[PDB]
């Protein structure tokens, strides 16, 4: 049963609209248990800076209950049924979701739809989870990959909305109020930008008959039923280093403007990142292991870790790497990390496209692997790339790669391009943007 | 045949290595894969093997030889390096082969 | 074509062979095996971790650099994980390349060389290994844990102690895969395949003697208390006593027993009232923490008890309250119904953990190994709601009663002994 | 003392009494010798059961007195002697603290000859405890007492040492005419009763080495 074949028999993701707007979509398996969640088009890109951490004000309390159910009544009803309640938010995509029995598929969807519409928003609660968030910030701040990411962001972007962290400012989870909370719901969980996602053991009717039932939005002038679009994005060639020679190791990241979602570009751009790959002090290869890169960081140990990474958003994008050494081994890192871009723009082969589309296409099927991780590619391929994206479609698409096109596309969006740099620890051995800069060209 | 098979003895006594105390393998000029090869030789071969090596220059620095009695005989020599040294030079072929490819 | 059948034959050697064409579009072919650090003796200790980090050095028909480079081609990936009693080895690739990823899963576990070079030039990732998995202090009082709960077989570390990095040989690997890695300890599982062939590959290739070779010294408990001062601000604490073991049906009075205290929470962020446990730990302490069900079902023995996580000073009145929160239900404290939901959320949780190629594979192969058999997922949802709740209540008796064994580190300071409780 | 010495004066803080454990810590460590210690609360320091533990040390061996020695008026070593073939050393633990005390064994012995010693060593104590103890190993303790005591305070710095601790202790000073009689103002009864006190109490226990023939305080 030939590869070929079975990524043919998988089957179709249904999708249907409502009148308000929202979008039901499911793929049915034979699973006796299932994953059911809206996923909302709304993040951190879309606060403003007086709301900066409403979004994530919201997922704190998404779950500390509703209106017709109070907290303990909330939970127990939950907890008591065996399922599994959880979700998240980022700078551009909102999501809460419920794994449970494919038998309380329907009584599932009452509860997702009565945390996205009637959201409790006890004031009691409210300076409580003021204490909480700003202790997670405490906890989130010693987190260097992640410091580093923002920081990121926050000068690749700096002066724009996808420069702010989705956590958002000291200040603003200080002084959030119940009504910006409240106006942050109202303004952005609406239909039009959710979609009821689920997959498993579910009758995709079945489903959109639930919808129909609790997801009942009423929509009258044009505003509601419309699909805002976002204030562009300006990215800018820059650098922001943290210096603290006082932390273990150090760690950089470098990147350029990505196409963003839409543009059939990011699949090619996937390959090549597969070429590079990525590397950990306790992978078993060692000097062996086909990436490049890889291997002189084994060879001279260079690192401890490095990851080739290509964040995607609807109107931009971040195509670079992150790796973490310490503080005397930096510089030569940074300069075999650049060597082997360079090597992807002009010299790539192919037999390391082979091996790149191969290594790409598992990881695109260990994507869907379980039931939150099918309904998640659902939920972000309706509300990013429009419908669904079947694997026999990537598939097709990433077979019609090769050297030519890696290189012609590498060439595209990372020679002679001004890059973002974000260091943070003890990073004296690597600088000088200058420099870094010249490494964006010859190879 | 036998042939080239008693020019060998004829051949290892010309070279004269023997006359140091050294094994044919003793004198092999130490390139990449001898390198990679002698780190895999057991402690106690590696040490017999270094001895052997500076007690020669130590003869050489004196301008003498072993006495007659001690030289190493032509089937007695060990080559305790030479299947060590093959593999190095086939894994190596394989690695060279495999990245053409 | 819909869903096939779970075949499963069993050969003469003892070699079991546990397959399941599901059709989708990745196979993952698995050799699940008796050996562990529980075989190992004082002689030659760490020599199974080892030989778990050794999966990618030089076999009789591959080498250390075609079996990377090779699998590494077809987008295909090699893992070990292992318990300490079970080792499993196994691939995962596209269909087309089952063949391929095979030749090496094969040559690894059947034709290893162990070369002194390539041994000795590896054992400093015992150094490096031990201390990423080390950062969690979560698995720092596991070891101290077992090693209290024991005197000898499971009492073993599942990390290569200190003293011998280093001093393990290749014949303490060979001679450790020799006497454990028999085709009557292994089973040959996999899905995404047809029978016909994970079955035809088993009897061509698949050489190694049989008969479970050495056999484990059984479980001696103790019933010790190991105590780790380190000044981390956090004092876990593990407090257990002997439970059930890989299969008694009193095992599943235990995991219902489980879910009953509470066994990690299911709502993001949430506050568990279903959990006895938790909730009995909250209107205890007033600051952070967690506080759970563990339990561990080995071969020939079991452990059972709670795990805290608290504030150094908050220990004491976490730990003590997590304790009458147990004897409370040792004494009646199980409602009928706690007793309804309990069975749901462990059919939920079994049923879920299938779901991931992983979970399913460790599901078939695990069952496959200790019984050459196969329960269906209706069979085993019967064993779990015919628990009385009666047998919880006797469970949770069996613990107050037993000795009980201890493992905490922290700023100990404020943390109570064993003898205390 | 007076003119020059200062700092503040009074108790200042005080050491919280030390609660007794009976523990168990084992040192798995790959080290080919086991050493071993197996004790019990001993007596405090001053206490009038000290003296006792004291005798009851020497009763047992407390470490040869003749190079390359076998010592035979020591019980225990003997007593171990006659149980393993190869070599080892076994000796009378006692420590005196202020508010407590300590007192056992102490055996250093081979990986695999580590069972046997240690538990003849044991067997070895609990003889000792119901009458196997002569009137005249009583009256010979009691000299080695007397000796070692006699000879540690020859060295300036043993002697300063024995001046101090009472000195600190007490502020007092026994004569060494006066520690004499406590020496021997003690029973064969005494000593036949620390023997017992010792079996009865509570144990803890301290090894390290190839402890894998090394038995667990709940065995012996």
């Given at each position: 049963?030939?590869y070929?074949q079975t990524?043919?028999?998988?089957?179709?993701?249904?999708?249907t609209?409502?009148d308000?707007?929202?979008?039901?979509?499911?793929?049915?398996?034979?699973?006796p248990?299932?994953?059911?969640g809206?996923?909302?088009?709304?993040?951190?890109?879309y606060?403003n800076?007086?709301n900066?951490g409403?979004?994530?004000?919201?997922?704190?309390?998404?779950?500390?209950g509703?209106?017709?159910?109070?907290?303990?009544?909330?939970e127990?009803?939950v907890?008591?049924?065996?399922?599994?309640?959880?979700?998240?938010?980022s700078?551009?995509?909102?999501?809460?979701?419920?794994k449970?029995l494919?038998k309380?598929?329907?009584?599932?969807?009452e509860l997702?739809?009565?945390?996205?519409?009637?959201?409790?928003?006890?004031?009691?609660?409210?300076?409580?989870?003021?204490?909480?968030?700003?202790?997670?910030?405490?906890?989130?701040?010693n987190?260097?990959?992640?410091?580093?990411?923002d920081?990121?962001?926050?000068?690749?972007?700096?002066g724009?909305?996808?420069?702010?962290?989705?956590?958002?400012?000291?200040?603003?989870?200080?002084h959030?109020?119940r009504?910006?909370?409240?106006?942050?719901?109202?303004?952005?969980f609406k239909?039009p930008?959710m979609v009821?996602?689920?997959?498993?053991?579910?009758?995709?009717?079945?489903?959109?008959?639930?919808?129909?039932q609790?997801?009942?939005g009423?929509?009258?002038?044009?505003?509601?039923d419309?699909?805002?679009?976002?204030?562009?994005?300006?990215?800018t060639g820059?650098?922001?280093?943290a210096r603290?020679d006082?932390?273990?190791?150090?760690?950089?990241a470098?990147a350029?403007?990505?196409?963003?979602w839409?543009?059939?570009?990011?699949?090619?751009?996937?390959?090549?990142?597969?070429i590079i790959?990525?590397?950990?002090?306790?992978?078993?290869?060692?000097?062996?292991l086909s990436?490049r890169?890889?291997?002189?960081?084994?060879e001279?140990?260079?690192?401890?870790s490095?990851?080739?990474?290509?964040?995607?958003?609807?109107?931009?994008?971040?195509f670079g790497?992150?790796?973490?050494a310490?503080?005397?081994?930096i510089?030569?890192?940074?300069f075999?990390?650049?060597?082997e871009?360079?090597?992807?723009?002009?010299?790539?082969?192919?037999?390391?496209?082979k091996?790149?589309?191969?290594?790409l296409?598992?990881?695109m099927?260990?994507?869907?692997?379980?039931?939150?991780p099918?309904c998640?590619?659902?939920?972000?391929?309706?509300?990013?790339?429009?419908?669904?994206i079947?694997?026999?479609?990537?598939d097709?698409?990433?077979?019609?790669?090769?050297?030519?096109?890696?290189?012609?596309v590498?060439?595209?969006?990372?020679?002679?391009?001004?890059?973002?740099?974000?260091?943070?620890?003890?990073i004296?051995?690597?600088?000088d943007?200058?420099?870094?800069?010249s490494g964006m060209y010859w190879? | 045949?036998?042939?080239?098979?008693?020019?060998?003895k004829?051949?290892?006594?010309?070279?004269?290595?023997?006359?140091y105390?050294?094994?044919?393998?003793?004198?092999?000029?130490?390139?990449?894969?001898?390198?990679?090869?002698?780190?895999?030789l057991?402690?106690?071969?590696?040490?017999?093997?270094?001895?052997?090596?500076k007690?020669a220059?130590?003869?050489?620095?004196?301008?003498?030889?072993?006495?007659?009695?001690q030289?190493?005989?032509?089937?007695?020599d060990?080559?305790?390096?030479?299947?060590?040294?093959?593999e190095?030079?086939?894994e190596?072929?394989?690695?060279?082969?495999?990245n053409?490819? | 074509?819909?869903?096939?059948?779970?075949?499963?034959?069993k050969?003469?050697?003892?070699?079991?062979?546990?397959?399941?064409?599901?059709?989708?579009?990745?196979?993952?072919?698995g050799?699940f095996?008796?050996?562990?650090?529980?075989?190992?003796?004082?002689?030659?200790?760490?020599?199974?971790?080892?030989?778990?980090?050794a999966?990618?050095?030089?076999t009789?028909?591959?080498s250390?650099?075609?079996?990377?480079?090779?699998?590494?081609?077809?987008?295909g990936?090699?893992?070990?994980y292992?318990?300490r009693?079970?080792?499993?080895?196994?691939?995962?690739?596209?269909?087309?390349?089952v063949?391929?990823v095979?030749?090496?899963l094969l040559?690894v576990?059947?034709?290893?060389?162990?070369?002194?070079?390539?041994?000795?030039?590896?054992?400093?990732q015992?150094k490096?290994?031990?201390?990423?998995?080390?950062?969690?202090?979560?698995?720092?009082?596991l070891?101290?844990?077992?090693?209290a709960?024991?005197?000898?077989?499971?009492?073993?570390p599942?990390?290569?102690?200190?003293?011998?990095i280093?001093?393990?040989?290749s014949?303490?690997?060979?001679?450790?895969?020799?006497?454990?890695?028999?085709?009557?300890?292994?089973?040959?599982?996999?899905?995404?395949?047809?029978?016909?062939?994970?079955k035809?590959v088993?009897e061509?290739?698949?050489?190694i003697?049989?008969?479970?070779?050495?056999?484990s010294?059984?479980?001696?408990?103790?019933?010790?208390?190991?105590?780790?001062?380190?000044?981390?601000?956090l004092?876990?604490?593990?407090?257990?006593?002997?439970g059930?073991?890989?299969?008694?049906?009193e095992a599943?009075?235990?995991?219902?027993?489980?879910?009953?205290?509470?066994?990690?929470?299911?709502?993001?962020?949430?506050?568990?009232?279903?959990?006895?446990?938790?909730?009995?730990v909250?209107?205890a302490?007033?600051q952070?923490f967690?506080?759970?069900?563990?339990?561990?079902n080995?071969?020939?023995?079991?452990?059972?008890?709670?795990?805290?996580?608290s504030?150094?000073?908050?220990?004491?009145?976490?730990?003590?309250?997590?304790?009458?929160?147990?004897?409370?239900?040792?004494?009646?404290?199980?409602?009928?119904?706690?007793v309804?939901?309990?069975?749901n959320?462990?059919?939920?949780?079994?049923?879920?953990?299938?779901?991931?190629?992983?979970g399913l594979?460790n599901?078939?192969?695990s069952?496959?190994?200790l019984?050459?058999?196969?329960t269906?997922?209706?069979?085993?949802?019967?064993?779990?709601?015919?628990v009385?709740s009666?047998?919880?209540?006797?469970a949770a008796?069996?613990?107050?009663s037993g000795?009980?064994?201890?493992?905490?580190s922290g700023?100990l300071?404020?943390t109570?002994?064993?003898?205390?409780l």
């Amino acid at each position: 049963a030939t590869y070929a074949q079975t990524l043919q028999n998988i089957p179709e993701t249904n999708v249907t609209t409502l009148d308000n707007g929202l979008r039901v979509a499911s793929e049915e398996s034979s699973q006796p248990t299932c994953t059911v969640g809206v996923w909302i088009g709304a993040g951190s890109r879309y606060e403003n800076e007086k709301n900066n951490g409403a979004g994530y004000f919201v997922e704190h309390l998404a779950f500390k209950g509703t209106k017709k159910r109070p907290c303990a009544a909330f939970e127990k009803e939950v907890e008591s049924m065996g399922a599994h309640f959880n979700g998240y938010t980022s700078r551009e995509q909102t999501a809460f979701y419920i794994k449970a029995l494919s038998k309380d598929m329907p009584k599932v969807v009452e509860l997702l739809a009565d945390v996205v519409q009637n959201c409790a928003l006890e004031e009691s609660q409210i300076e409580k989870e003021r204490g909480v968030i700003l202790q997670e910030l405490k906890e989130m701040d010693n987190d260097m990959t992640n410091v580093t990411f923002d920081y990121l962001h926050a000068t690749a972007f700096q002066g724009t909305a996808l420069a702010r962290t989705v956590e958002g400012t000291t200040e603003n989870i200080k002084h959030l109020t119940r009504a910006d909370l409240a106006s942050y719901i109202d303004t952005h969980f609406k239909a039009p930008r959710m979609v009821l996602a689920a997959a498993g053991g579910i009758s995709h009717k079945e489903l959109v008959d639930a919808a129909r039932q609790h997801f009942s939005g009423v929509s009258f002038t044009y505003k509601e039923d419309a699909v805002p679009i976002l204030p562009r994005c300006r990215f800018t060639g820059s650098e922001i280093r943290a210096r603290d020679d006082a932390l273990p190791v150090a760690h950089v990241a470098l990147a350029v403007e990505g196409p963003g979602w839409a543009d059939p570009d990011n699949v090619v751009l996937h390959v090549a990142n597969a070429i590079i790959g990525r590397y950990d002090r306790t992978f078993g290869g060692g000097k062996h292991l086909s990436s490049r890169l890889a291997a002189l960081a084994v060879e001279h140990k260079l690192c401890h870790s490095f990851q080739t990474f290509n964040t995607s958003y609807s109107d931009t994008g971040l195509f670079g790497f992150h790796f973490v050494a310490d503080p005397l081994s930096i510089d030569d890192m940074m300069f075999c990390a650049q060597g082997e871009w360079m090597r992807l723009c002009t010299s790539t082969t192919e037999s390391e496209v082979k091996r790149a589309k191969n290594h790409l296409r598992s990881a695109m099927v260990a994507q869907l692997d379980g039931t939150t991780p099918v309904c998640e590619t659902i939920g972000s391929h309706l509300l990013n790339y429009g419908r669904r994206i079947s694997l026999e479609e990537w598939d097709s698409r990433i077979s019609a790669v090769d050297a030519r096109m890696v290189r012609d596309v590498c060439s595209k969006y990372i020679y002679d391009k001004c890059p973002a740099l974000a260091a943070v620890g003890p990073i004296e051995q690597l600088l000088d943007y200058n420099r870094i800069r010249s490494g964006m060209y010859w190879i | 045949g036998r042939l080239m098979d008693r020019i060998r003895k004829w051949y290892y006594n010309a070279a004269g290595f023997n006359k140091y105390g050294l094994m044919r393998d003793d004198t092999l000029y130490e390139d990449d894969d001898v390198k990679e090869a002698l780190k895999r030789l057991p402690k106690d071969l590696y040490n017999e093997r270094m001895f052997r090596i500076k007690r020669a220059l130590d003869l050489s620095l004196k301008h003498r030889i072993l006495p007659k009695e001690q030289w190493v005989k032509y089937e007695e020599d060990k080559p305790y390096l030479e299947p060590y040294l093959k593999e190095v030079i086939r894994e190596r072929l394989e690695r060279e082969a495999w990245n053409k490819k | 074509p819909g869903a096939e059948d779970l075949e499963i034959t069993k050969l003469p050697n003892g070699l079991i062979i546990a397959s399941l064409e599901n059709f989708s579009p990745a196979s993952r072919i698995g050799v699940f095996i008796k050996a562990g650090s529980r075989y190992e003796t004082t002689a030659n200790l760490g020599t199974a971790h080892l030989l778990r980090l050794a999966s990618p050095l030089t076999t009789k028909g591959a080498s250390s650099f075609r079996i990377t480079r090779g699998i590494e081609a077809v987008g295909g990936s090699l893992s070990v994980y292992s318990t300490r009693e079970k080792m499993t080895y196994c691939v995962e690739c596209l269909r087309d390349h089952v063949d391929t990823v095979m030749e090496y899963l094969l040559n690894v576990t059947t034709a290893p060389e162990f070369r002194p070079w390539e041994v000795t030039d590896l054992q400093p990732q015992l150094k490096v290994d031990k201390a990423v998995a080390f950062q969690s202090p979560q698995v720092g009082v596991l070891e101290n844990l077992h090693a209290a709960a024991y005197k000898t077989a499971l009492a073993n570390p599942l990390y290569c102690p200190d003293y011998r990095i280093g001093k393990i040989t290749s014949e303490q690997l060979h001679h450790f895969v020799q006497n454990n890695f028999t085709s009557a300890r292994m089973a040959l599982v996999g899905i995404g395949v047809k029978h016909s062939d994970l079955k035809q590959v088993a009897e061509q290739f698949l050489n190694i003697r049989s008969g479970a070779g050495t056999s484990s010294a059984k479980a001696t408990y103790w019933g010790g208390e190991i105590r780790e001062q380190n000044g981390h601000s956090l004092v876990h604490a593990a407090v257990v006593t002997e439970g059930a073991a890989v299969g008694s049906a009193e095992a599943n009075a235990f995991s219902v027993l489980q879910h009953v205290l509470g066994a990690g929470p299911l709502i993001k962020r949430g506050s568990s009232v279903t959990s006895k446990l938790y909730q009995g730990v909250a209107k205890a302490t007033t600051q952070p923490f967690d506080a759970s069900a563990f339990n561990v079902n080995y071969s020939d023995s079991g452990l059972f008890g709670f795990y805290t996580i608290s504030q150094a000073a908050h220990a004491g009145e976490v730990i003590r309250a997590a304790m009458n929160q147990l004897k409370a239900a040792a004494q009646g404290g199980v409602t009928e119904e706690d007793v309804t939901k309990a069975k749901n959320q462990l059919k939920a949780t079994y049923l879920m953990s299938v779901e991931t190629a992983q979970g399913l594979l460790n599901e078939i192969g695990s069952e496959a190994l200790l019984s050459g058999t196969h329960t269906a997922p209706s069979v085993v949802a019967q064993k779990i709601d015919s628990v009385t709740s009666a047998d919880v209540v006797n469970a949770a008796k069996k613990f107050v009663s037993g000795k009980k064994s201890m493992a905490a580190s922290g700023d100990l300071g404020s943390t109570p002994f064993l003898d205390e409780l």
